[model samples]
Target: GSLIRATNLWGYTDLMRELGADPLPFLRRFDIPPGIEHQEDAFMSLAGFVRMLEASAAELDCPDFGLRLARWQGLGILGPVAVIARNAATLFGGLEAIGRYLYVHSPALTLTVSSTTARSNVRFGYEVTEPGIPYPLQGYELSMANAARMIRLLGGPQARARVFSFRHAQLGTDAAYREALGCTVRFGRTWCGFEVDHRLAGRPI
Candidate 1:
C-alpha cells in the first residue's frame, strides 16, 4: 500500500476525542502511532488511513463522519496550498493553482477543473497507478467537501454551487450531505466534483 501524508490526519484525533472515542487506541488499530497527528511531514499507510476512517465511522455509528471531519477542519489543514490558491488573481487561477500543487499534500489525489460557457466544473479523484489499492471513499468525501468550501472562500459568498456530485454512494441521508455541502448533492456518479457559474470562476476575489 502507498503512504499518505500524516498531515491529512490533522483533525481526526480531536474529532474522535470530542465524540468520546479514545483517539490513541483507535489510531493504533490502524497502525497510526500515538501522537502521529501532529507531525506535519509524517507518513502513514494509505490503506491504514482509509481503514481508520471507516472503522471510526462504524464504531461511532456516524455515517456522515467524513463530511463532519471536513466541515469543522481549519484552513491550516490545507497547509501552504491554501495560501497559494487564495493569492491567485482570479478564482479560476486559484483552481488551477490548487490542481497543479495539490500533490504536495496528498500524492494520491488529483484536482481537475474545466469551464464551459455557463459553468466551471471541478472534479477530484485519485490517480491510481498501483494495483490492489483500496479507494479511500471517506478521504475523497473530505477532500471534495473542503475543495468546494475553499472555492467559495476564494470566490466569495455568492460563489455558490450549481450542483455537487460524489463518486461514492451516499454515506448517510441526503439531508446531512446537502447540509454539509450547502448545495444539491448527487451521489454514485462518475466523479466527485462541484460546479459553479462560469462568471464566478473568472471573477477576482
Candidate 2:
C-alpha cells in the first residue's frame, strides 16, 4: 500500500515504530514488488509520512492509529448484521441494520429522514463548516444527486419523483441537477427533501 511505503509521508511509520512497529521486519512481511523501494514516492521520509498521516487522521478526528482499529470494528459492527441476513427476509432488514451506524456528526454533511403519506424521504445537506472541508459546494450536491440515483436504482428510476435542494449559494450547474434527478430541481431553499409515491414502497433491488 502507498501508506506503508510513504515513510516520509509525515513520518507516519516512525510513530508506528515508536509504538512497537519493526519497520524492516514489517516491510519484509509484504512481498513488495522489486523497484518499489527505490520509487520516488510522495513521502520521502519518516517524518513527512507521519505528518501526512497525522493530518489525514485529524480530518477523521482520529489522531491515533485507533481509527484503523475502528475500521476493523466497522466490520464487527456490520458483520453480525450480515450474518443475521441469512434469508431474503433478513437481508431486507439489513438496511435498518447498517443505517444504525451510518451516522457522521460533521457540520459539513448532515442526514435526516422523514415519513409522509406517500412514502419515506431522506435529506442530505452540507455547508462550508471549516477550512479544507471544500468550497463551491458542488461536491455535496453531486452527492445528493448520487443519492437520487441510488433511489432511482432502488425504486425503479422513478424513486426520486421529486428532488429539492437548499444550497447556501447558487450551484450554477442547475442543469446537472435536473439531468441527474430527472425531476423538479429547486434551489435557493432552506431544506432538501424528496417525495415518493406510497405505492412504490418496498421497491425491488
Give the TM-scores of the predictions, in the order they appear.
0.86, 0.42
lDDT of 1 by residue, 103-170 (tens): 76667666666655553454333342224556767766776667667766888865666677877778
lDDT of 2: 0.38
Model 2 poorest 10 in a row by lDDT: 1-10
Q: Cα deviation in Å at residue 171, candidate 2?
A: 2.6
lDDT string, candidate 2, 1-205, tens digits: 1222221122224444555544444333433332343444322222222333334344433333422322122222222333332222321232333233332212233344445456455333333233332232333443344445445544554555555564545433555456656677666677654444444434444
Candidate 1 residue pairs in backbone clash: none
- Please give the distance, in angstroms, between residue 78's alpha carbon in candidate 2 and its true position after superposition: 13
Q: Return the top candidate by TM-score.
A: 1
- In candidate 2, how many Å is residue 159 off? 3.2
Residue 98, model 1, lDDT: 76
